Amino acid sequence: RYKAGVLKYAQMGYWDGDYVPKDTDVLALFRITPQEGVDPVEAAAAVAGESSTATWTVVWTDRLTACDSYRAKAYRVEPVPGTPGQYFCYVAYDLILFEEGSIANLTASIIGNVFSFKPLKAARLEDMRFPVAYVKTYKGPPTGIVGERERLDKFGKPLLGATTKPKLGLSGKNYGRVVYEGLKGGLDFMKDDENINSQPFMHWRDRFLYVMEAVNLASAQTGEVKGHYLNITAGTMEEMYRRAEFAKSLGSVIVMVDLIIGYTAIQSISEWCRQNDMILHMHRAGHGTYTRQKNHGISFRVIAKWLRLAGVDHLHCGTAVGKLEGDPLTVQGYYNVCREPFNTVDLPRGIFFEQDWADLRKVMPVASGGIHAGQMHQLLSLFGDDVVLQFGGGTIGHPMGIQAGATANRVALEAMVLARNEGRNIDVEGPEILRAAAKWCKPLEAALDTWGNITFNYTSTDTSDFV
């Protein structure tokens, strides 16, 4: 088996049906659609091969190292129910192949070159198991759910947010005025847009100064600890550290970071935020490029697992009822990944492996994108308390102003939490509770008339296969 020539991956020693994975093994699922003629066993072994220690032809240098330990092994292949030509493939990897405390190395191995293979039509990474031995090498999130709520002294309900609208255009003076009117109205957080950085119309260092004056003026007049997600996303790391150090110098509670910057750049801020007492917010920009398609890419639950290990306190996980793509059961899957310390296997919610995080900090999930006061009963029923609800359009787009829009969303949420704890069903009586609160609250009545019939309903692309 070491003579010169081209041999099949199943014959080379990558497929083993009788193999039982150990407790110290990285497990990965692959939703493989093979080409016409290619066997699913050969398709699995090709994925198991190139992701670890294989090439197209046999080399004599394989006899030097103990290959039986280093080679990844595909152990079982099962057909996906519903689809005629699609297969689940379980691949086991050993800890000897992975670097301690590196997301970049983990992705270079598993999702390296397996996607661009000719014998496969479409491959998708569904779920990934991490052993207890591997999770302990990572530091985890800087604060978590517990650590953040103690800093802000806010308990018993979702934290409210709003994106400063419009996205681009506003100068430093006027940008802070929208922030000031938002936070004083009743919002816990305001934020920068993902594209806002250091544009010619408004410099970053000017924005940072004017929002911090708006935060402290709102904090004095309400008596609450307010915050603004300061966008530090830059071209280089040298610029990025300088933006973060100035954010610390002003005394900001929390800074935001885009997903585009890369896992190597993300892990650097996670180390920085812990060593300077800062809460980290992640905005998933350009995630839908490789997440939305059900047949090809990487499922968000795997990305959420990597981002928990990298060390982020906040993460956008999606809204089931919002303007963006999301299926209620699949969305709840992403929420359970970043919150629960130990999650059991559940096929309707898209969990395939029993994951044990072993005392890593809980990432607080953020629901954002096309939501308002009328959607409040559905949001509280699906997720719970330890979430962040963001109303970008639903606050500023209010007919009365910004202060009234912030009050309308705050009154709506406070009425729902009070009704839920008393023993009233928030799924059925939900709309009636909001109408009853509108009798004494005038800004809430105006908000319900504006966005009453406005609902984003479309067929979800990323759906479950066991329903």
Partner: protein, 129 residues
């Protein structure tokens, strides 16, 4: 001057009967036997010219000795050594190394002293041959 790089250097030159006994130990434990040669016997010089491929699955000590005599005919005035390679879970390295053939006269080393900052000296070892 005699270069003592490797095992059995202080002992007198090993006869073919003694070499055959040493290889028999290496093949018994399950090591790959390889022949290497050079004209530059510098300390910390890692890579010597390999005489073909290492003998991985060979259960005969006589088979190595044929390749050793073939290497002596091709390279008379060179340092020939035997390297036994371990292929286990933790080791993955050379286990035994000993010079079997050394040239008629051993080359000496000249040391050049470059004066840097303070009293520190950079040393350069160079072979006369």
């Amino acid at each position: 001057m005699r270069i003592t790089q490797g095992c059995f250097s202080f002992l007198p030159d090993l006869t073919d009967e003694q070499i055959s006994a040493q290889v028999d130990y290496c093949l018994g434990r399950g090591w790959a036997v390889s022949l290497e040669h050079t004209d530059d016997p510098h300390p910390r010089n890692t890579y010597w010219e390999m005489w073909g491929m290492p003998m991985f699955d060979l259960r005969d000590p006589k088979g190595v000795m044929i390749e050793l005599d073939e290497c002596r005919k091709a390279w008379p005035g060179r340092y020939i050594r035997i390297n036994a390679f371990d292929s286990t879970r933790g080791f993955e390295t050379v286990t035994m190394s000993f010079i079997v053939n050394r040239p008629e006269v051993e080359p000496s080393l000249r040391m050049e002293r470059t004066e840097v900052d303070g009293r520190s000296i950079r040393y350069t070892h160079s072979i006369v041959r």
